[PDB]
Swiss-Prot record:
Belongs to the cystatin family. One of its GO terms (molecular function) is peptidase inhibitor activity. A motif (Secondary area of contact) lies at residues 44-48. It comes from Homo sapiens. Potential cerebrospinal fluid marker for the diagnosis of Creutzfeldt-Jakob disease. This is Cystatin-C. Keywords: Age-related macular degeneration, Amyloid, Amyloidosis, Disease variant, Disulfide bond, Glycoprotein, Phosphoprotein, Protease inhibitor, Secreted, Signal, Thiol protease inhibitor. The chain holds residues 38 to 146 of 146 of the full protein. GO terms for biological process: defense response; immune response; negative regulation of blood vessel remodeling; negative regulation of collagen catabolic process; negative regulation of elastin catabolic process; negative regulation of extracellular matrix disassembly; negative regulation of peptidase activity; negative regulation of proteolysis. One of its GO terms (cellular component) is endoplasmic reticulum lumen. It is linked to Cerebral amyloid angiopathy, CST3-related: An autosomal dominant disorder characterized by cystatin C amyloid accumulation in the walls of arteries, arterioles, and sometimes capillaries and veins of the brain, and in various organs including lymphoid tissue, spleen, salivary glands, and seminal vesicles. Amyloid deposition in the cerebral vessels results in intracranial hemorrhage and premature stroke. Cystatin C levels in the cerebrospinal fluid are abnormally low. Macular degeneration, age-related, 11: A form of age-related macular degeneration, a multifactorial eye disease and the most common cause of irreversible vision loss in the developed world. In most patients, the disease is manifest as ophthalmoscopically visible yellowish accumulations of protein and lipid that lie beneath the retinal pigment epithelium and within an elastin-containing structure known as Bruch membrane. Disulfide bonds join 62-72, 86-106.
Length: 109
């Protein structure tokens, strides 16, 4: 590879959800962050599948306790949305049930 990939693919969508779940698990935020736009998606196939995803992330108005995490709009104030630009590397071995986050790097966008 790395050939191009698309958020239209199941694997990319599954990996993006994994990555954002991890990002949230690691955060000190009281609030759920979620993916705004997938900017670039590449995948490399071999021993497993390596997904490389570049993503804009934003803070939402829902808390992490909030039992529902699915009608969660982004903050409308820039200094509260705090848009971030993220590069994720996901190593998945789907035929063995493995999915791990190799690399996660986020700067302010």
């Amino acid at each position: 590879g790395p050939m191009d990939a698309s958020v239209e693919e199941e694997g990319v969508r599954r990996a993006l959800d994994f990555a954002v779940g991890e990002y949230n698990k690691a955060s000190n935020d009281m609030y759920h962050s979620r993916a705004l736009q997938v900017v670039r998606a590449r995948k490399q196939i071999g021993a497993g599948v390596n997904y490389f995803l570049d993503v804009e992330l934003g803070r939402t108005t829902c808390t992490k306790t909030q039992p529902n995490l699915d009608n969660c709009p982004f903050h409308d104030q820039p200094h509260l949305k705090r848009k971030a630009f993220c590069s994720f590397q996901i190593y998945a071995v789907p035929w063995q049930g493995t999915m791990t986050l190799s690399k996660s790097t986020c700067q302010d966008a």
